[PDB]
Amino acid sequence: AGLLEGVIKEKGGVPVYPSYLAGEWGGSGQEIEVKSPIDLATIAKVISPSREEVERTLDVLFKRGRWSARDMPGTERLAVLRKAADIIERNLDVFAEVLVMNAGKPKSAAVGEVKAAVDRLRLAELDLKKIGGDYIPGDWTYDTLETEGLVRREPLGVVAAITPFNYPLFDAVNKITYSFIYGNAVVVKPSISDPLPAAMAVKALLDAGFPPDAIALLNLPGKEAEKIVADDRVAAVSFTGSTEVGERVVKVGGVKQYVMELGGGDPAIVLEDADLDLAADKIARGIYSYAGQRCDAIKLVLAERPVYGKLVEEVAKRLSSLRVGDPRDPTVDVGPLISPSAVDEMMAAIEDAVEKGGRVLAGGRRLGPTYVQPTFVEAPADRVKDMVLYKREVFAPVALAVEVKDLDQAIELANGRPYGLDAAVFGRDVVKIRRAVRLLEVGAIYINDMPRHGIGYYPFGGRKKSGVFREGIGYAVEAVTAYKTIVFNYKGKGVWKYE
Amino acid sequence: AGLLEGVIKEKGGVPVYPSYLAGEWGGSGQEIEVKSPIDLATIAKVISPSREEVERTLDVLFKRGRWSARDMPGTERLAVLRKAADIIERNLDVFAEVLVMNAGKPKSAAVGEVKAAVDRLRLAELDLKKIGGDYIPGDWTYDTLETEGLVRREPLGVVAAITPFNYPLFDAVNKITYSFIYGNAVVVKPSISDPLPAAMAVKALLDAGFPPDAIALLNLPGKEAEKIVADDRVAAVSFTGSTEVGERVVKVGGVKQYVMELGGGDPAIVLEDADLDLAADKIARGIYSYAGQRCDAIKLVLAERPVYGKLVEEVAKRLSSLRVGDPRDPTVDVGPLISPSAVDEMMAAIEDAVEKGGRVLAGGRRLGPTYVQPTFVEAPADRVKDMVLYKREVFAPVALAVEVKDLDQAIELANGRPYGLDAAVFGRDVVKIRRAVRLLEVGAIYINDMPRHGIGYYPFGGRKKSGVFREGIGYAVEAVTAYKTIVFNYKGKGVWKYE
Amino acid sequence: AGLLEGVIKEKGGVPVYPSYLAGEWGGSGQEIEVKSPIDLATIAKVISPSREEVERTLDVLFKRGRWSARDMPGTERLAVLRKAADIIERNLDVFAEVLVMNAGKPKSAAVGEVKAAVDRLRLAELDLKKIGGDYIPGDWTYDTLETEGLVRREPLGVVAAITPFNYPLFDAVNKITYSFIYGNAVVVKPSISDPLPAAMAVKALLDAGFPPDAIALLNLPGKEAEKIVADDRVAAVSFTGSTEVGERVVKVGGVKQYVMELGGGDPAIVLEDADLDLAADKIARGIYSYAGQRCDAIKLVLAERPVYGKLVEEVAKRLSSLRVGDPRDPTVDVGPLISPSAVDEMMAAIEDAVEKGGRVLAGGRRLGPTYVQPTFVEAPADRVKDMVLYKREVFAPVALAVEVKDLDQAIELANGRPYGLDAAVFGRDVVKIRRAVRLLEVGAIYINDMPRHGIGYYPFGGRKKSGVFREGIGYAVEAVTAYKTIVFNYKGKGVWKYE
Amino acid sequence: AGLLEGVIKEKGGVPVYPSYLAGEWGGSGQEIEVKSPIDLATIAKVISPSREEVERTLDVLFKRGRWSARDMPGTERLAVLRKAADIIERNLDVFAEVLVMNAGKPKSAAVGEVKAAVDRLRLAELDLKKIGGDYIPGDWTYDTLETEGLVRREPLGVVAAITPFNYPLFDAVNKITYSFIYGNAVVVKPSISDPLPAAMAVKALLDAGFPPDAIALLNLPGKEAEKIVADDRVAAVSFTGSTEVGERVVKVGGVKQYVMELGGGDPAIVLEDADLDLAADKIARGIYSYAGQRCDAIKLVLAERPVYGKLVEEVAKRLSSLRVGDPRDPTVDVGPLISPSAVDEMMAAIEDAVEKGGRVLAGGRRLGPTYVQPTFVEAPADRVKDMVLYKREVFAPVALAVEVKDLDQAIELANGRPYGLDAAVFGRDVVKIRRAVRLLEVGAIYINDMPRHGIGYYPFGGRKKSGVFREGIGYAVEAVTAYKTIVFNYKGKGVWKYE
Ligand code: NA
Ligand code: NA
Ligand code: NA
Ligand code: NA
Structure with missing residues (x-):
């Protein structure tokens, strides 16, 4: 219930959480049990997508998602995030309750995580501190005389956000936030151990107006997620997990931008x-x-x-x-x-x-x-x-x-x-x-x-086996964006008179 | 001859170029012929290092190289590069001659490449434009009140520079330059198709004072170089090559920082x-x-x-x-x-x-x-x-x-x-x-x-299959350096009075 | 009436607007008529402060204001500004009505100005893009070896904001906003031609929680304001006016930081x-x-x-x-x-x-x-x-x-x-x-x-006679802040080993 | 003698140093004695320019100097400075000798100052760290949608460098260096107490190729220099002196950019x-x-x-x-x-x-x-x-x-x-x-x-009475340069599709 009203299916006896396929909630793959560390009991199930659905979702994110996210001006993206923050905040106890039960997190810590997610969404404006570009004049080298450069950032396209079990809510919100703020579409793949908070977060974002074809939530278990990582429509992978899985992720993905927070x-x-x-x-x-x-x-x-x-x-x-x-x-x-x-x-x-x-x-x-x-x-x-x-x-x-x-x-x-x-x-x-x-x-x-x-x-x-790159307000932009250089040539066109 | 006086061995009939093993020129692995596209004739040979020598070299670069490079102050690193520029410049015709013969590059283009290498070394001071760090005050969030952050860059350690055949001289010099300027040690692996210009460049750097245990030049053929890429003492890989080999490089290296210029x-x-x-x-x-x-x-x-x-x-x-x-x-x-x-x-x-x-x-x-x-x-x-x-x-x-x-x-x-x-x-x-x-x-x-x-x-x-990240004066620092954040805690220590 | 309930005095026949003396609304100097260009009729009066009151106000701003503003953490300053935005927005028609009558501004333009003031307050977070500091490593010169620098900004203290008649509302809000966001106290001196919108803005800020001893609003006519500009407790002057008055302002103020938007x-x-x-x-x-x-x-x-x-x-x-x-x-x-x-x-x-x-x-x-x-x-x-x-x-x-x-x-x-x-x-x-x-x-x-x-x-x-320096989100920080450099000396202390 | 061969006039008994009038050394105003604090004896004389010569010099600097300086590409300006460094370095003992005698500075300190001047000139490349511009995308506000900004720096034109007696050599070189590197022409006004080192510096710069109509050296005493400060062709004044003279300088100059290092x-x-x-x-x-x-x-x-x-x-x-x-x-x-x-x-x-x-x-x-x-x-x-x-x-x-x-x-x-x-x-x-x-x-x-x-x-x-603004490698650019903003309008032109 709650914000997941028409989403969750009270099929049989336990609530059944479907995947979000970039447009419609659903899925026709194996259902999987979600147990609680508090009593090893099954508290819900998630519907993993079939191979064809993974394929169709990636296709939508790439052909439409990239553009819906990118063509929504930043001022509006911020409104979406702020609205999502409001929704999560009013549904706080429920988000917290699910963290406590699904992750086994003490109540105070669970409430802290929800408040972190809310603050993160609400403070997306701070990520703009690293938004400007660079103007490089060309007269500091004879070879570049009467030339000029502009360096600006651009979203990469589709970012895969792979999430760990210890911050099922915050990590999904954080990765979605920094990826979306710059104009990317996002595929979230939460830990199948506790995927429910992510489902709640995504729904809140959709209710807030997040481009419906610019986000996906696939409840794929472990190596099933490799199909996403290795796909060429996925331009970046933001992963927080163990050193060993991180290694596997890069080896499957090959050349792409990565942010690997591998702990230790x-x-x-x-x-x-x-x-x-x-x-x-x-x-x-x-x-x-x-x-x-x-x-x-x-x-x-x-x-x-x-x-x-x-x-x-x-x-x-x-x-x-x-x-x-x-x-x-x-x-x-x-x-x-x-x-x-x-x-x-x-x-x-x-x-x-x-x-x-x-x-x-x-x-x-x-x-x-x-x-x-x-x-x-x-x-x-x-x-x-x-x-x-x-x-x-x-x-x-x-x-x-x-x-x-x-x-x-x-x-x-x-x-x-x-x-x-x-x-x-x-x-x-x-x-x-x-x-x-x-x-x-x-x-x-x-x-x-x-x-x-x-x-x-x-x-x-x-550093060392703890991974590569950084997360953080502002810095995260480096992992989900790429530079675009523009070189203007005015050689002999009379703009400068030998300088 | 020339700057390679006591290095090259006129063994038998053709000049034999040994590898530089971070301290001493040498090698005891298979010798390999270097032919010219101009007449398909063998113009020299290179001695590839044995597995034990690759192992020993990496060990030296890691245990000593990182420190020799890093503990040499930047002002001195710049002197080294400027001196190296001078040496290459006075030996210009010879560097050009070898490019023309070994790479098949027209004379004017060959001279242009040498002049590029020289300018690059001489302009390493410009790479300092992206050298500063960041001071982040903490009073913009209640959670961070009376807190403060400092973000600065640090060399990663040992950088593997893998070079293509089309700019055998410039690419080695460029990659060595941006890696070394920030304090890293470097392992250069030139194309076995035309490794001679790299040998000449390294020797010039050594003559200029480059920390002798902070650089290596291994004449390893294709997949033999995988031992270097996959090694945990190699913190970064700067690769310029084909899309297909680049993919293989990341899949072998796993999690590390990369700059892949894959052309197309x-x-x-x-x-x-x-x-x-x-x-x-x-x-x-x-x-x-x-x-x-x-x-x-x-x-x-x-x-x-x-x-x-x-x-x-x-x-x-x-x-x-x-x-x-x-x-x-x-x-x-x-x-x-x-x-x-x-x-x-x-x-x-x-x-x-x-x-x-x-x-x-x-x-x-x-x-x-x-x-x-x-x-x-x-x-x-x-x-x-x-x-x-x-x-x-x-x-x-x-x-x-x-x-x-x-x-x-x-x-x-x-x-x-x-x-x-x-x-x-x-x-x-x-x-x-x-x-x-x-x-x-x-x-x-x-x-x-x-x-x-x-x-x-x-x-x-x-972008797309052309690779990831950037090279360029200043920007290259992102691929061979890592951020180091320092968070100071003055909570309740009386520095600030509630602010 | 409105937010000026207990402030405005319906003394005699026309509303009498008092000055805000950094703590209490008031004043005991000459009263001055405020006419409308629409019908040359007197629509109100303002009480200018006596010399002793100007003196006491500056003294409060300097001895207490600087600290109230500065010791209020930035996260709270932003809340104050956002609240002030809300207040002005709900009182929009009234702010607009007063602009139309007092300044003679068409209705659409008057509403545009109020909406500008609101947006400016609400977007103060963007001014943080130019908030970080700089970390300067010292090994790029032998003279600075084992040394290090940190460059950060600091509020100057008391900023005098002198306002023109053409944007009586926006200019006061803009100047107050960028001065206050960095921790300065502010003395606003609006054009005596139409000082009412400023009075309304200040009251809204005070209602929002603006440190009561960190702001002042003095209805001083022309050359009477020179006492403020020439005072040593005023560290900066943000002026928008004519070229001729701007010149006089600098000549009276002497050495201080200035931002002069002189139009033309x-x-x-x-x-x-x-x-x-x-x-x-x-x-x-x-x-x-x-x-x-x-x-x-x-x-x-x-x-x-x-x-x-x-x-x-x-x-x-x-x-x-x-x-x-x-x-x-x-x-x-x-x-x-x-x-x-x-x-x-x-x-x-x-x-x-x-x-x-x-x-x-x-x-x-x-x-x-x-x-x-x-x-x-x-x-x-x-x-x-x-x-x-x-x-x-x-x-x-x-x-x-x-x-x-x-x-x-x-x-x-x-x-x-x-x-x-x-x-x-x-x-x-x-x-x-x-x-x-x-x-x-x-x-x-x-x-x-x-x-x-x-x-x-x-x-x-x-440029030329149009003034010096810039206003703008982020850039304004240069006029109301000063650099503070911190040089650390670790010479011979074993942090670095010759580098 | 030395580099001042055909410049100094051994008229009568003591060497007579003329002013440099932006093109030709000379002057037809009162001659003035230069004594040494070592023995209160007259060691030389300087020819101050007549009013007409001050007027003509400013006119040349403005109509031609600004363009000669600006139209000389930065790569060449750097060559000029590096050459000047070389000249001063080979004439070290002589520069030092004159500092010791004219300023009364101990030998070691005098040599230190000359070496500072040389290093400053030679390190002008570091001032480029603050050379880039800013690219501001416009989609973070509805009002700026489909709009874009570029912020870059531009030289102001003619910079007046007023120098104190305690660093007659370094201060002239420093101020000339940071003003010229960005494309400004410069008017140096050294302390009439010890103007000789400045004369030697200027000549060295001219020998090095400094645009001859882009620099001037006027040996004007105290209040005579006010004509320069108050002139509208002087866009900036870089002053290092006492608090009291600094105050007078701003009061005479009016609105302009300033850097006042007032000591204390x-x-x-x-x-x-x-x-x-x-x-x-x-x-x-x-x-x-x-x-x-x-x-x-x-x-x-x-x-x-x-x-x-x-x-x-x-x-x-x-x-x-x-x-x-x-x-x-x-x-x-x-x-x-x-x-x-x-x-x-x-x-x-x-x-x-x-x-x-x-x-x-x-x-x-x-x-x-x-x-x-x-x-x-x-x-x-x-x-x-x-x-x-x-x-x-x-x-x-x-x-x-x-x-x-x-x-x-x-x-x-x-x-x-x-x-x-x-x-x-x-x-x-x-x-x-x-x-x-x-x-x-x-x-x-x-x-x-x-x-x-x-x-x-x-x-x-x-801060306080010690002045305003900063000098320093990189930071000095703020005092002798101005921002130039370029706003591009693509509203409804199909570049963006609502974003
Ligand atoms: Na791949
Ligand atoms: Na690995
Ligand atoms: Na003053
Ligand atoms: Na003036």
Whole structure:
């Protein structure tokens, strides 16, 4: 019900969400169950499109969508987005309810995500800061005399937005927003794990006036989405997911523009002059938020000798005093993980750390097929690098703690992981901070705060295995737009008199 | 001899060019013959590196090269490039001689390329126009209050520069220049068809002081270079080549930053109010320069009814009055094509056009295993789209001529090819010009001039199958650099008093 | 009444508008009559502040205003402006009614101005496009090695906004908007000729939440405002007025930042290939809008031989078929001029043109102390330069028409006036257009349209006697902000290792 | 002699330097003596131009100069500057010798200035970073639909460069460089106190090929230069001088573009966590360099309680151990002040500080009509604000030392002076540093280093009485260039289909 009135089919017993085929909601492919991590129960089904429908949708997006999106002036695109924001905002509780149930996200976090989606849509005007073009005069080279250049951006056409499970609502809205604001049509492919919030977002956009043939929502499972990525009518792919799937995406897509936010964890470094209360507080939150299911979840804590004790102590106190349970109790801090499978990996990873000399300082206990206590494992620097928790990203609420002699060792250990998304540094000395900033191989460094992307007010993205390019208000334009250069020739035409 | 004194080995009978392994010239892999299109004779050999040497080179570039390049301040990097420019300039005739012989490039064109390489090195200071960073204040959102961002660029590390056969000298110098100026180390992989100019360029850079462990030159043939592209220590790949190899490159490399200049041809449009003398002159040159072996060679001419006759007439007069022969005679305009194989394709492509209703207006005659007359084939709009010359890029001096009723038909036919590098439009009416600019799906549009990239004073690159991203003074920084965001948190620290 | 409920004093017989003294509405200086050009009748009075009140107001703005404005975060400043927009929009008819009566502006134009003010306030987010700062790395010079710079903008403090009579509402709103958005406090000094719309605007801003001690509205007459300009607490002066008063303003103010939009007229050039219907239509409107009382009113028409006849004919037909009368009749096109004095000058200027060989092609007849027919005077190029209509700006609906042989003569005659605000060029040939663009000495050139500033979507401002600097969304920041450079020194501190 | 071979007239007994009148060296006005502060002896004479010659020069610069400068392509302007750099560099000792003798500058400092001039000329390519223009699409507002804007910069025409006595060489070269690089003609008016270095610079530029009618050098004394400033052919004035003369300059010039670097002193703040050795060293140098005759000379030292003792102690030790004498001895650190008059003021200012409770910690002794020991006066915060050394800028090597309780008091005392050029802050805590950066009302803040403008690698300029606008590589373009906006109208012309 709600804004999905005539869309959802109460076929049989559970609500059946159809795909949006660039013009009409529908689909005639396999139906698929959508379960909740809260009780492993089926809360709905989605109709995936048949091959012919994928083909027809791409064809519409390309032959008509590109033009409907592009030929709608920017001032109107903004109105559409602002209206969509209004719709989502008045249906807030419902968007939040679905996030909590479908994603297992605590209530406060679920409401935060909806408010992020709304703000993002409402602030699309800020993305215009990187809208101008360039005028290049040609008299700075004899070869270009009496010549002139104009460099401006142009939408690419059809952008494929592939979305992960941890921000089913925000990610779809964000990617649709920055792709559409510049004149592109968009194909959204949400995680089949929790595709419902995307369906709600798309409908809200359509109600707001989004060109009906300029957007599609295909509930394709995993490798079925490869048909979209590899298609030549898809000029760009905005992907947020795991390193491994990202690799597969580029290998299937070949030459195209890409933005790959591949996550991995984030290390946090605490210097001897850091505000330890702030640090402990921020680091604990970074470790457990949404049960560590955040691309930028803190996975490693490095603190200099003289504060390692206090710091680790506080973070552990904070972590163990956390109420775990059903996401609905505004009291609960940590809800469930997306699947029993994820919890298995977390547990196997903790034993590994212990087997290699690691000691659990907090948590450690599993609580159910999809429930676990946020864990903090102490580890000696001379053995941490071979531990799974270090070498890999265990998508769960678990982090390593490691005492270090100085900044160089912290930086070294921090750079030792295969990832490079963000890093956090707590301290006050400008020199040490500047050195850390220069040497940490990451897309972003958070000084005296936990890494938090929010609506992308500041650009962020990966280095190393964390991906390529950036998302963010303004910067995202680089991934879904292409330059168009115009060279004017006035050689010998009397505009300039030798200059 | 020359600057390659102690490098080249006059082993046996022909000069043997070794690879540069990031520290020492050498190699212990298969030797390979380098023939000249001028007489299909072997003019030298190159020593390809063994697998272990490729491995060791990448290891040096990554563990040491990145730091030697990066830790050399920009002011010094510029001195290195300026010195290298001086060396190449004093050895001009020799660089030119080798281009003429190894690439089959006419003398004037060969000298032009050397002068381009020199200018590019000497003008590296202009690439600094896109060097600054961004300061983002945080008070424009409640969520970011008392926060602040700094966005700056950083070198990626090791850049793989894969080079084509048509600009063996300039392309290596260009790619090395923009990669090195920002602090990256570089692995150059020239076309095994004519790798000698690259060898000469690298040596000149080394003599100039280029960090010896920050550059490598591997004479690997085709698929052997895949080891480099697929390696995780290679953070970026700057490729100029064919659409098909480019696709393979991304599929092997996976997630990384890329700049793919994939060529394809360029269409030129002539409006009824164009200066026909200028148009005919510029279009003819665009059709035959370097025997059409230019990513931006004109391959299709579209002219409105009232001028189609004169225009086509003039271009044909100009084309047929062209002296073909040995590149050395400053008299010769068109030298040979890179291989008998290329000429075969051109011929088979001309018959195809004729078989489908096409009529040769100039040229058509083959002159030897690697020699041909630049050809101009007339064709009816209602049949051109199925001709090979239209559907594909025949890398040779051949173009189609097609009469059209108006601009919309010109634009339509122009956009009908699978490529989108540049396009040229001759005319004077601002409205018609503006419409053409908006609707031509290409990286660049040249108004009243033939498409010419030169040293990249203006950015250029492809749309559609012509590739992704741009090269050019300043813009190239986007392909070999990554953003680094720094977020400062002063929440509640008294810097701001609620703002 | 209305939003001025408890503000306006119905003292005696006419409404008495007090000044806003940065905290409280009031004033104890001479009261001054505000008459309407429609019937020379007194429609209200304004209370000018006493010297002590001017002094106290400046003191409040400086000691408190700067901080209230600055310490209110930008996100909130935007909310204030958006709210103010809403208030003005719902009180539209009333704002329009007051413009029509107080300024003598036709109804449609009056409504257009109110809608401009509203849009300007509502679009303050676009001014953020020029908000970022610059990060300057220091390794491009040996002298700056291991050094770094950050360049950001800062509000200046107290900005004096001096407003003209022709856009009593919009100009106050525009200047307040761009000054306040960056954190400055503002002192508005409207034309004592029609200060009422400003009073209404300020009240709306205050109702919206504008920091009460960060704004002032002083109804000071002419030279009384010099006390404000010359005061050291006023860091900038944004002035739109006549060349002569502007000169006096700088001479009194001394060293400070300035934006001087000094008007003067605009010449329009018509080439032989122009769309004459469009040209005649646009030029006629440029000549008469608001009875030529626009900084950018067309005052000179130059058309090439082959179209001069038709062009001049059409513009004259259009001008003479204009209904002149009371601004209220949505039928009336031209209302009255601001004062009998202005009409006198227009008449004396027309005789002068006739005496020097000029011939009236339309209008010429005076209709009352403040009413006149829009006039079009033909003139020979060899005598126009000595005519008052050419040498000076006659603020009224009157323009000269001059036949010319070619573009160079048009450009020459156009540049012959002492002003340089905008110019218009109608034609289609890119070369001729480009030449005109390069050689016209003006702040802006309108191709195929009459000069129209609108809300400043495009920056505009003068050259020559038309003033200095620009207004416009984004660009205005340069006049009310100052750079702040921060240089960090890490020499020998181990951040960089020689680079 | 030297490059001034046929220029200087050995008339009578001393060399007679004529003015350069935009075409020919000469002049027929009063001759004026140029004395040296080293021995108050006359070392040369300059011929000031007659009124008719000033008039003729301005006329040439305006009617021809603007075009010679502008019509010389930028690539050539750069060659001219690079050649001029070469000439000055080979004549280094001579340029230095003249600075030492004419300005009284120590040898090392004199050589530093010449090397600055050379680097500035040679690095003019960096000024191109702020050369591009802007392309503004019009579909973000209904009012601008099917419209488009291009914003580019244009030279203003004739720039008046008025130079101070403390950098007779560099300032002339800097101002000429940034004015000329963008296409302006320039009128240099050096301090009549030491105009010789400017004469040498101009000649070098002319020898290098600088358009002979695009530059002038008028040896006009003080108020005689007002004729230039007030002239309408002078579109901009770049002034570096005292606050009082700057004020007079704007009041005479009226509306025009200005860059006023008005100096005043700089305060330096030392926090409890500063490297005191670095601080003492840098602050001492800031206090005495060139005998404090630097716009950015440190005039006030504020140090927090816990380090005030050590800090003040060290700076005093360093100051008193300074060798004062003839600028030639590479041993001498401090040469003479520009005039006996300046030393008088310094002495009267020191007594004033003592009379108001101040205590001399170093220096204090006068050594001759133009010689003095660099002085450091201790003072209680509760009495410093009324001391001349605080309230005014005593152009000499003298600074106040004041102990303070915390940062807020330092900032408060620092902001208490009427000037706002730069400030220095030594410390390591990021929060305290950030607060100081936000609250210091100055054009620039130097963290952990003395304020030093160098060649302007980082922009710098004043706030408060220190002036308006900035100089610096790139930024200077704002003072000698104007925007030119071009608005294209395609309404209803079929370029866009409603967008
Ligand atoms: Na592909
Ligand atoms: Na890979
Ligand atoms: Na003043
Ligand atoms: Na003046």
